Design a protein around this ligand. Structure first.
Ligand SMILES: COc1cccc2cc(C(=O)Nc3ccc(S(N)(=O)=O)cc3)c(=O)oc12
Ligand SMILES: [Zn+2]
Length: 258
C-alpha cells in the first residue's frame, strides 16, 4: 500500500508515511500575483541547455521522466535567485484528466492543464542524493502548459509514450533538446519549497515561469493514455498526478518582473 494519486493513497494520505507533508516549506503553492513582490535584486535566469544529453525516458508509476547524463557540467541552470550552478538531471510533467486541472502550482487560483518540472541539483553537493538533503540542494524550473497550438518540440516525447505505457518500462531517448520546451520569456516567480512527491524533502528553490507554453489537445491526450499500473495489471490511467496547493506559511514569493 504505497503512495500514489488514488482515492486511498493520494496527497491527503502522504503525511502518514512522510510527516514533512505538513512542514513549513511544502510545495506546490498558489502564486498570488498581487502579493508577490517585485525584487529588483533578482537576476535574469541563465538556462544553458546547448550541450544537454538526454539518455532515456522512464515510466516510474507516477509520471514519466526524461533523464539526462549529469556526469559533466553540460545542461545547467544559474542566476535568477540561485547561488552557484545547478545541473539538469531529469524533467517530467504533472497533468489532469481534463484540461481544467493538472498543474501543481496555481496562479491566482488558476489551474493549468499541466506543469513541466525541469529538475536540477546544486553541484556544490556532488550528486543528487546528497543535494536533496540540503535546503539549497535543488532548483526546479516549473513551466505551465495550456491547451491550444501544438508545441513542436514536445512531439518527440509524445511519440515515445506508446513504448512506456506501464510502470517500470523505459526506452532509449537520446538527443532530445529541452530548449524546445521553453517559452519566450524567462520572467519568473521564486520561493523556497519542497519536492511535490514523497519524500517531500524541503530542498527546492522553485522558479516558476510566468509564460505558459501551448501544447495541443492531441499532445496532452497522449499523456493521458499512460498507465500508473505495471504491465498485466488492471488498467489505471495516469491522470491527475498533481499535488494540490499547500499552505504558504511564513514564505514570500518574489517576482523577477514588474
Ligand atoms: C532512492 O530514491 C530514488 C532512487 C532513484 C531516483 C530517485 C529520484 C528522485 C527524484 O528525483 N524525485 C523527485 C524529483 C522531483 C520532484 S518535483 N515534482 O519536481 O518536486 C519530486 C520528486 C527521488 O526522490 O528518489 C530517487
Ligand atoms: Zn514534479
Amino acid at each position: 500500500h504505497h503512495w500514489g494519486y488514488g482515492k486511498h493513497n493520494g496527497p491527503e494520505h502522504w503525511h502518514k508515511d512522510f510527516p514533512i507533508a505538513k512542514g513549513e516549506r511544502q510545495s506546490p503553492v498558489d502564486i498570488d500575483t498581487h502579493t508577490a513582490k517585485y525584487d529588483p535584486s533578482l537576476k535574469p535566469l541563465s538556462v544553458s541547455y546547448d550541450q544537454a544529453t538526454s539518455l532515456r525516458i522512464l515510466n516510474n508509476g507516477h509520471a514519466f521522466n526524461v533523464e539526462f547524463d549529469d556526469s559533466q557540467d553540460k545542461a545547467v541552470l544559474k542566476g535568477g535567485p540561485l547561488d552557484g550552478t545547478y545541473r539538469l538531471i531529469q524533467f517530467h510533467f504533472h497533468w489532469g484528466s481534463l484540461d481544467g486541472q493538472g498543474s501543481e502550482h496555481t496562479v491566482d487560483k488558476k489551474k493549468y492543464a499541466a506543469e513541466l518540472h525541469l529538475v536540477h541539483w546544486n553541484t556544490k553537493y556532488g550528486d543528487f542524493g546528497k543535494a536533496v538533503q540540503q535546503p539549497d540542494g535543488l532548483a526546479v524550473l516549473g513551466i505551465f502548459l495550456k491547451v491550444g497550438s501544438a508545441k513542436p518540440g514536445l512531439q518527440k516525447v509524445v511519440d515515445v509514450l506508446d513504448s512506456i505505457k506501464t510502470k517500470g518500462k523505459s526506452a532509449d531517448f537520446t538527443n532530445f533538446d529541452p530548449r524546445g520546451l521553453l517559452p519566450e520569456s524567462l520572467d519568473y516567480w521564486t520561493y523556497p519549497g519542497s519536492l511535490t512527491t514523497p519524500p517531500l524533502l524541503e530542498c527546492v528553490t522553485w522558479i516558476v515561469l510566468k509564460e505558459p507554453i501551448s501544447v495541443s489537445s492531441e499532445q496532452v491526450l497522449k499523456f493521458r493514455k499512460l498507465n500508473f499500473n505495471g504491465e498485466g495489471e488492471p488498467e489505471e490511467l495516469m491522470v491527475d498526478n498533481w499535488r494540490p496547493a499547500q499552505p504558504l506559511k511564513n514564505r514570500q514569493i518574489k517576482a523577477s518582473f514588474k
